[PDB]
Write a protein that binds this ligand. Sequence first.
Ligand code: CA
Ligand code: NA
Length: 259
Amino acid sequence: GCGELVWVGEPLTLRTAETITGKYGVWMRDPKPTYPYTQETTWRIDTVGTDVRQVFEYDLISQFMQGYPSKVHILPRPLESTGAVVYSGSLYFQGAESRTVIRYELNTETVKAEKEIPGAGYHGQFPYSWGGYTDIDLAVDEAGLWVIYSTDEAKGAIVLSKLNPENLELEQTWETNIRKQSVANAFIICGTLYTVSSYTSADATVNFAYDTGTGISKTLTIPFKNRYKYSSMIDYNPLEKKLFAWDNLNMVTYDIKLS
Ligand SMILES: [Ca+2]
Ligand code: NA
């Protein structure tokens, strides 16, 4: 059961990074956890630097909030920005300085697929408003795996494609009429693209929505606060039905309300 986003709030900090190297990054959980993982398994990637490859893995939420990682994966390839997601036992991330999406099976630590997103800009071409090499933004919702980006053909407007979680083949593609660079970030809920924009570093709003079903968009005003004033990523988890975000060394979640 899905619905339309009508509310965002109740930001909760779950974990503060140990060092300044965790100023920004991406943390997430698997909406469709596979053995030996569960709905509590938590992955954390500090992305401060040029050589990002370590992936902290926590078995329990108590472990994630208090103790140490159960395991540390070393990615064969370097990771770009904060747009990665975990889905069905695999990490989906962007190859550094490339337009290549990579499926990395966590349990076997094996690369299952590599796929350039056709015509997509990368490494500074189409980042979100605050920049940060955020050209390519992966997403998981109730329908599965998506990728958010832009192309020259789309004239810098946000483009979203439904991805095959197995071989990363583009199944469907939608062109919007909103510039990706005019927006702070984005996520997908029940097949609906939502964008986030900032009046300030602490003040944010969900300002736009595009339904891939109907094909029509809306302007919106759904305010929420960036408590620590430097958000580097915000994704949606279709299982917990919350927003996961990274804000100035803090790994936070937002609760939401769907109509
Ligand atoms: Ca996002
Ligand atoms: Na993402």
